[PDB]
Ligand binder design. Structure first.
Ligand SMILES: *[C@@H]1O[C@H](CO)[C@@H](O[C@@H]2O[C@H](CO)[C@@H](O[C@@H]3O[C@H](CO[C@H]4O[C@H](CO)[C@@H](O)[C@H](O)[C@@H]4O)[C@@H](O)[C@H](O)[C@@H]3O)[C@H](O)[C@H]2NC(C)=O)[C@H](O)[C@H]1NC(C)=O
Ligand SMILES: *[C@@H]1O[C@H](CO)[C@@H](O[C@@H]2O[C@H](CO)[C@@H](O)[C@H](O)[C@H]2NC(C)=O)[C@H](O)[C@H]1NC(C)=O
Ligand SMILES: O=P(O)(O)OC[C@H]1O[C@@H](O)[C@@H](O)[C@@H](O)[C@@H]1O
Ligand SMILES: O=P(O)(O)OC[C@H]1O[C@@H](O)[C@@H](O)[C@@H](O)[C@@H]1O
Lengths: 151, 145
């Protein structure tokens, strides 16, 4: 019912479990941000290791078309990767819904850069961009502030 | 002889990093036989073989050079107070990551006090079937909003 790590198990995997544990106070929260202009107005909902979608799909981050509440899963938390930088944490959710035309029809993916901010536990979640111009390895990029990424 | 993208916003971002082009950033890390020295440059040759390397990994034990990413294949994104620079096209792995080409992802965070400093490796994700990557960080006032 929480984040599941993907990758090789070992010393590094063990460190990533520790990072997820540190983010526990954020689990109960839900972050949202609406961007874009009609007919492409989108609302992104992001959560840390908890269901961010409306259909129990295991979504960690979803995209909702404002015009018509169509929900698209950007990434699932059962496919998480996480890394600790000096003043930030990079959180990745793979296994989102598949593209039909772009990116070799691969599953969508979310990359969230959580930067250190001593003033708040969590705030300023914002979509940065969607890299959908590659034949593979595409991603939706986001940012958010959190004191938990600080040294 | 400069970064080649795959976007007007991206070209503007590259332009913004111009003052870093002439610099060379180095950082040694790890413990032999796994001690590596990383050399990173923005849109300029970081290697010794004119291969177009934007970031190379040097094995300190024997001086062997491995290209992590080529500025021949650059992607760049701008967050509120950070810039993400990506160089794909590095040397291929022999065993990890389906033998794909190495890749470098550099998180350039805002720091009002320096034009560019604190370049360092953060981690190497080499446990995936594909889309592996070397993660780095560095500070720069140019990343500040
Ligand atoms: C960006 O610049 C890169 C460096 O200049 C480009 O890399 C080169 O890309 C070409 C075209 O895809 C590759 O050509 C292939 O070569 C292999 C043989 O590879 C092996 O032998 C060569 C020569 O001895 C050696 O350089 C390689 O490392 C391998 O040992 C052929 O079997 C294929 O048919 C094809 O000709 C080059 O191999 C590749 N060289 C490298 C890694 O620098 C890259 O394509 C450019 N990307 C762009 C256009 O954005
Ligand atoms: C993460 O969770 C998703 C959603 O449950 C898993 O995707 C399903 O995988 C099964 C088996 O491969 C398929 O039959 C379903 O059609 C998939 N549903 C989708 C794509 O939404 C996914 O396999 C999980 N990742 C893991 C644990 O490997
Ligand atoms: O699936 P295709 O046809 O390639 O379209 C892809 C696009 O779909 C839309 O519904 C949104 O989710 C966009 O962010 C996405 O880039
Ligand atoms: O080429 P293989 O055997 O897969 O080993 C991969 C490793 O090689 C070393 O020389 C370094 O470049 C490491 O960063 C890399 O992870």
């Amino acid at each position: 019912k929480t984040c599941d790590l993907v990758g090789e198990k070992g010393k590094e995997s063990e460190k990533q479990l520790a990072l997820l544990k540190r983010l526990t106070p954020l689990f109960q929260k839900s972050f949202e941000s609406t961007v874009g202009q009609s007919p492409d107005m989108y609302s992104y909902v992001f959560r840390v290791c908890r269901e961010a979608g409306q259909h129990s799909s295991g979504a960690g981050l979803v995209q909702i078309q404002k015009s018509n509440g169509k929900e698209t899963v950007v990434g699932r938390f059962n496919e998480t990767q996480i890394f600790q930088g000096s003043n930030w944490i990079m959180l990745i959710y793979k296994g989102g819904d598949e593209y039909d035309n772009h990116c070799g029809r691969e599953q969508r993916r979310a990359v969230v850069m959580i930067s250190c901010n001593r003033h708040t536990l969590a705030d300023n979640f914002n979509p940065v961009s969607e890299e959908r111009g590659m034949v593979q390895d595409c991603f939706y990029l986001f940012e958010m502030d959190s004191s938990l990424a600080c040294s």
